[PDB]
Design a protein around this ligand. Structure first.
Ligand SMILES: COCCCOc1ccc(C#C[C@@]2(O)CN3CCC2CC3)c(Cc2ccccc2)n1
Ligand SMILES: COCCCOc1ccc(C#C[C@@]2(O)CN3CCC2CC3)c(Cc2ccccc2)n1
Ligand SMILES: COCCCOc1ccc(C#C[C@@]2(O)CN3CCC2CC3)c(Cc2ccccc2)n1
Ligand SMILES: COCCCOc1ccc(C#C[C@@]2(O)CN3CCC2CC3)c(Cc2ccccc2)n1
Lengths: 341, 341, 341, 341
């Protein structure tokens, strides 16, 4: 019992936000998801440490998942804060892993490698085009979408058919990662070395240097560039709706809907707002609470996404460049929503 | 009309959950059970209220049922909040009561009296032996099983052969009560004054002072006594199944299954759980939602009780000495379960 | 009464359907047919445990029919569900046995033995050819035909000049059994350990791996392999009609016509259907409701059979590999039905 | 001492291909390689036997490596020829295993267990994609390349850095295992039941039924497919050239180079050759004698490899489909060789 407790204790300590949503699931579902998260967290931890040689990463990450069967493996000099204790006591994670159904072990191990390999691809090349941006997000978010979906099936809580086409599942992950990449633009831009995710194929149409946006000036394009990033994100919404409306199990739904609705609300805020280049754009605790409270069933869930979407569209002028691309990205979204009510 | 609307309004107020389950019954049977619950409720409001003297209770309780024919009666000095209001306006209960079929009225009175007496017995003495434990749960729960079963037969929805041996009916109520007694340990002991139900004949083998389970120091002995308790409740599982399998009506079944399935799920969570000693362990709103949805038919019900049963035996370790008492009990439970598939 | 009650409350607990058809019969024969069924199922239960030794079967099976007196018998560690209860409390079957007339008693014994050995012959061996097929079905199903036919005779209800030739009596059994083997495939293929009854001589022509059928990428050949199975079945049809036509007792006809009609209906549904490889295919409640209702006399029976035989021919087209063939088999069937109108 | 005798004895009886290259190793390292082989050999005998329930393999194969410490362990009746005698007296192995550098023991156990679970993972599922193919070859061959590589470093004969990247080592195993699968096509497709490894993602393009590759009628699409397989295998060559060129110890190089060269020689003979679909194409013993004699030095090895890679290419012609892909892969392997000269 000491193993699973260490997992949940470090989970809540390294990702309190997500640590709350995950408590929507129960029994073995939450157990697997918890371990699944920690593994990917450990993986990303190593891949994020810049004091680690590139080669070491290029040959260790690809076989990271192999340590999932070695109940003796662990690290000692890596990890930021509590992220350290996770790698130093990984034994608890792997030992808990070996208790999950053989079905859960595979999805986790499989995704861990696929993601790890995807990370190695970007450890040697920059993110220039949108394809790169969509592929990168697919590795750190999209695949996460695949894994979870494969879990709802292996659990028997959802219809086996939910895993034929994972396009939407991938969309579920992209909507979150992108909404995040946008908001967390300032924190990521100043860090040394600077971690950039915004594709040159999008910001180059606005500036020569990206780290020139902090400056209160150029603020006119910063917005236009930001909106371009938002629009690019509003593309996944329609698919997000489709994926949610395909969920039947109440537990699996709340765990899948809460993050999405939370993202749409986040976008409706960061959209067409300069304050994104200087500080953290967060939703009010009241909005956070309610979302976590009503996103238990489709209807009410679609009912909120529908609201935030309008509060996103109803914030720009026909003078703002994207009044068109958005006016459609909004209808396309609302449509999908209206087609399930 | 208005009396009924009060009873149903006070119901969801004093006990939401049950107020949702009771909706599984038809207006006919529902009106009776709702009043049956409020009677036993107002009765408990007197027993559990330590703010008043014992000579007041042993004076009022014994003749509580008699008040059912006095639509004027009411008590205005016992209980807290809602429950307190239930007594000050007990009139509505008796009102609607007089509007019930004689058959129902009598069953509600017989149980109210027999329970009232039982409460008095344990009102001037504690629970030391297991027999005490069982006998008590009988007076406050087992009898409810008898009453309900009698109401089912009386109504005609269930066959008369059901009331031949109220043994399994008693088991139904015991499984629920024991599960609650096991979960609300910390809450009941942090009561002023402390409320204890765990039979001395049991904790006596793990500590001389039950209050030691609150301190982590005795975490081992605590969880070791907790598992002993859970083991005591598993004895009723095989019987609960039999009773649920003897029900023919779809409405009565659901109303009888849901609670049982909710208890098993809860029992699988608090099993070998130490959190039980510092907080209240509960199922996820989503899981309790999945239970209300499928506890409509026997089979679907049996596989849920099965799953949760297997979950209980899984969270078990071979290292500790309770693994044996249980392994044997889980089999008798799963056996009886498969014994109907 | 205490013994038959058990025999009935148990019969009604494993084959709800047959437990409804058996009531078409008369008290004298019903009680007999009932015990006759139980004994056989009690037998199949022994012949169908995969967590039980082989040298236990024969050593115990061929002494099965012998143990049908010795009212002091019973097996405590056999099957699952109610079945094991039938064996752990087999006693009620042996006294209700003698309690019952003996003209039948001998028939039960005769087959009970024959069938048991037929099962022994196949325990270690398996089905490689259609010869193994028709043979196996003979022991488990065909013989039930001989039996029932015999019981019919000895009861004076049917002509003694009917137990002379038993060919058709075997066809009734094979048809019923073979139809179940086709419909209950996925259910059997998923048995753990696996259960196979399909002639190696047949699927060796549409594939090289039977378990493969679970696939969705072998369909085309899987269905035509199914068509072949159905084709093989339709060979008994003409002989089924003939038998039903000979029966002259209203009560004995219904009990012998419904199962057949139910089979033809099911067979006319599984034919050229892929759904058979991922779920059980069964007649709608309304369809089966009409079957029990009309299959009381010959004419009505022959008409439904025909109707269903004309729905199995409506699913195929010229492009089919068994098309021009089945039209032949479908004819031989109708011809027979049409020669009694 | 007497036990290593049994080990080498059995070794020379079971494996006639590797037995020679192993015997030529340096005593110390050799014993571990001998036992390492005998271990995997015992494991395989289990997976490759069709008289065992696959329901008990999945439950015990993953435990097989545990017996490596229990000198009293052995298996009663499984496997034929000498392989049977292998487990019956598996003690000689385990006791010889005991007296080996703990490092060697850890490597054998690790690979053994990992390979075992890989077999179970492929006992239920089959090879449909080119992923299942590479993954399967990985479990039963790539891992062997891992173990040996680990054993090399463990002995100190090779630099500790040889274990850094095990990707090339994996390529080593795949080149051998694949060449055999391609060469043993006929021998395998004519089994009871049949054995197949050629990925559907490849042959589904050249036929509807793989078995159709035995008829002179489908001789055209048979070869065209065989070429697809050869190309797939020719992908691992470049890495093979790299791994060999990384070995510094003569003993290790000879043992590693010979098998690789032999495979390429065999591949150059089966390529575009159609006798494969009915006979077992092989290298003349005089050729495998020339290879053993010269594959002791890098340059000599690279040379032989090149000339075998060249004639494999000088086999196809313009009118051949694979012509283009072969050139690329061939010249790709060539360049790798000329790179180390
Ligand atoms: C129904 O579809 C569900 C789609 C979920 O989409 C995604 C997308 C990205 C993430 C994430 C994340 C992290 O911030 C946490 N750790 C894993 C990747 C990164 C960095 C370390 C996550 C969070 C996540 C991570 C691991 C397990 C579950 C969920 N989910
Ligand atoms: C088919 O068998 C049915 C067995 C039902 O078993 C149980 C067991 C315990 C309870 C309860 C309860 C209470 O908390 C609510 N009130 C009545 C007894 C106590 C205190 C006041 C109850 C809830 C209950 C009580 C009265 C009426 C309906 C349901 N049922
Ligand atoms: C007028 O001709 C009548 C032909 C009846 O043909 C058949 C064929 C098969 C069966 C059957 C069956 C079982 O599923 C039930 N038990 C007996 C054999 C198997 C397994 C255990 C049965 C059902 C059966 C079994 C026992 C007694 C009566 C009928 N009948
Ligand atoms: C320097 O890199 C060396 C790469 C060697 O590549 C490979 C690839 C495949 C095999 C093999 C094999 C087997 O047929 C024999 N047994 C082990 C795996 C299978 C089945 C049972 C083997 C043969 C083998 C197996 C065990 C010990 C030594 C060699 N080696």
């Amino acid at each position: 019992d000491e193993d699973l407790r260490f997992c949940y204790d470090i989970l809540q300590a390294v990702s309190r936000s997500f640590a709350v949503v995950i408590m929507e699931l129960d029994e073995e579902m939450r157990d697997a998801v918890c371990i699944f998260y920690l593994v990917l967290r450990a993986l990303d931890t190593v891949e994020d440490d810049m004091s680690i040689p590139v080669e070491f990463k290029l040959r260790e990450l690809p076989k990271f998942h192999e340590h999932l069967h070695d109940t003796t493996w662990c690290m000692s000099g890596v990890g930021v804060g509590r992220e350290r204790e996770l790698l130093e006591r990984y034994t608890h994670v792997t030992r808990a892993y070996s208790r999950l159904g053989k079905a859960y072990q595979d999805v986790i191990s499989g995704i861990c490698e696929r993601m790890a390999n995807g990370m190695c691809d970007f450890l040697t090349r920059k993110v220039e085009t949108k394809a790169d941006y969509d592929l990168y997000c697919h590795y750190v978010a999209g695949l996460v979408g695949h894994g979870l979906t494969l879990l709802y099936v292996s659990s028997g809580l959802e219809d086996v058919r939910l895993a034929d086409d994972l396009t939407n599942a991938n969309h579920m992950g992209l909507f979150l990662q992108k909404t995040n990449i946008i908001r967390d633009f300032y924190e990521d831009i100043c860090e040394v070395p600077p971690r950039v995710f915004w594709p040159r194929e999008i910001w180059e149409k606005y500036t020569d240097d990206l780290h020139a946006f902090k400056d209160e000036l150029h603020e006119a394009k910063a917005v236009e560039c930001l909106n371009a990033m938002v629009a690019d994100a509003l593309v996944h919404v329609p698919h997000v709706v489709e994926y949610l409306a395909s969920l039947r199990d109440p537990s699996v739904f709340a765990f899948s809907a809460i993050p999405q609705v939370m993202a749409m609300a986040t976008l409706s805020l960061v959209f067409n707002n300069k304050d994104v280049f200087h500080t953290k754009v967060k939703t009010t605790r009241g909005a956070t609470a309610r979302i976590f409270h009503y996103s238990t069933e489709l209807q009410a869930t679609l009912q909120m996404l529908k609201t935030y979407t309008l509060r996103l569209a109803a914030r720009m002028n026909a003078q703002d460049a994207c009044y068109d691309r958005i006016e459609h990205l909004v209808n396309d979204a609302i449509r999908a929503m209206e087609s399930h009510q």
